[PDB]
Design a protein around this ligand. Structure first.
Ligand code: CL
Lengths: 306, 311
């Protein structure tokens, strides 16, 4: 396969390794309880959280329903923090001060100790705003609760946002998707040629944005499948919550089932001419030269094209 | 309610009466020990077993690791057996010879005596393959074994590879076509009849589902299960019997701990789904539906139902 090195970034199971729509791919103890937390190795471009029946944006600091998901005021203020502020903050750290924008944001979020637990490996995720050059640390690592109903989504208002786990790798631009591939269709390398993906499901999509949106909706998810009828502390932890009104969430019921490990309907071929989004769940291993198509993934930016 | 007679086949507790994802709804003695075995009265369309970290397919005869779940070769060969071979085999039996292929495969499997036990009521289940018109008697009636322990690990699933298979207990009824679900209902949504109207099911759990097959898979996964929740440390002989195993390498499995109804669903579960084809959402619920709503955006499915076939 002449396509192996090129196609490496599209093996989402390998290179990302956790959920995309909902990333809760690891567990980490904070003060004696194991909490779920995002753990994917790639940035998720254009991902944010929509709070339903509300005008509050999710990057609004948590209420200390009026509030969002972001870190409340700390002293000194750790979040939000601009790119320049971050580089100045870490000036004495050779291995941190020069990391790319997104990786720096991830590492910065990763320096926030949870709940004065100095032993803990738990690290908060973050959102980077590329327009504002601002890093927002998320206090709430839950992504879907469908007190607050909400869901993850690509939305036109989120196009400059990137959702970042603690695990985002420093060379993500070499090894992860970002841009959509114009004039290219994902395929499978079989006996010296790029063949069509055998099984695809097709949907109407007015533009590339709408196709990327759909793929995202259907992509790898670490959200629980079985769960009680009412919200319970056990259900909250399974959704990625850690804190409730001034105490940690605990549950006698906590002892790997919910982890996708990157498995899902993560790829799409958008036919710009017929306005159909072609969605599949096997990793592609080549490209087909087809001028009618744009190749997208749930990780990819919903608009940007190369 | 004008829907009563029409909706009877969606009363899964009544018409099927056992687990769907894992069906172990009866016990039957073989050589002095009670074993668990499938007892559902309806066929389960598109159900097979996935063996983990293995190149072995579940319809391969048992190893006699390299093996599956199917009957080892017998003389005369009783399994696998084609429809035509079955009809010829039972040519002298008026009551069996002209049964529908599914009920026939169930009855054929039910004629295998377990472990030379002349008067046992234990009857092996079977899988009928509609593509090759072959009946496969299963020697292993276990359907799930994947505890954190050592995970020969396996689980039940609907999968594209299994779409022409039907998993058949010994109790599959001869008139299943009239009394059991099979086809999904296109342009229809399950509801509840309230005051001269078909109303929405009050509580549904909603999930993303790219197509009807995926919705049907999800419903099956959440459906009535007779599996022990008793996932514990090592796999003990008692645990094996609770999982539906009967044999282990030249002896019956036995246990002093076997008491002489707790893991039986009797068909109670998240057995139904309304799939919204326009929003790609699978809405799953655990109460029997009692009418249909005319909605072009939906397809009504059950855990029993074929994962593709529509009406
Ligand atoms: Cl029982």
């Amino acid at each position: 396969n002449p396509w192996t090195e090129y196609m490496a970034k599209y093996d989402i199971e390998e290179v990302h390794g956790s959920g995309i729509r909902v990333d809760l791919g690891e567990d980490a103890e904070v003060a004696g309880t194991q909490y779920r937390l995002p753990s994917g190795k790639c940035p998720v471009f254009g991902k944010g959280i929509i709070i339903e029946n509300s005008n509050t944006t999710f990057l609004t600091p948590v209420a200390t329903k009026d509030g969002g998901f972001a870190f409340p005021p700390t002293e000194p203020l750790m979040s939000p923090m601009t790119l320049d502020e971050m580089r100045h903050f870490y000036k004495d750290n050779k291995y941190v001060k020069n990391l790319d924008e997104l990786t720096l944001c991830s590492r910065h979020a990763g320096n926030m100790i949870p709940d004065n637990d100095k032993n803990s490996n738990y690290k908060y995720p973050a959102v980077y705003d590329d327009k504002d050059k601002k890093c927002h640390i998320l206090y709430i690592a839950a992504q879907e609760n469908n007190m607050f109903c909400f869901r993850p989504a690509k939305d036109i208002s989120f196009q400059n946002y990137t959702y970042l786990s603690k695990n985002v790798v420093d060379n993500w631009e070499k090894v992860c998707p970002r841009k959509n591939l114009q004039n290219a269709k994902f395929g499978l390398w079989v006996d010296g040629n790029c063949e069509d993906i055998p099984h695809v499901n097709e949907f109407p999509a007015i533009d590339l944005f709408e196709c990327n949106k759909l793929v995202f909706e259907l992509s790898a998810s670490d959200q629980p499948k079985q769960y009680e009828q009412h919200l319970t502390d056990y259900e909250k932890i399974k959704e990625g919550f850690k804190n409730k009104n001034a105490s940690m969430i605990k549950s006698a019921f906590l002892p790997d089932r919910y982890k996708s490990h990157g498995k899902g309907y993560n790829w799409g071929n958008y036919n710009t001419e017929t306005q159909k989004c072609e969605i599949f769940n096997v990793k592609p291993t080549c490209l087909i030269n087809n001028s009618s198509y744009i190749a997208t993934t749930a990780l990819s930016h919903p608009i940007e094209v190369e």
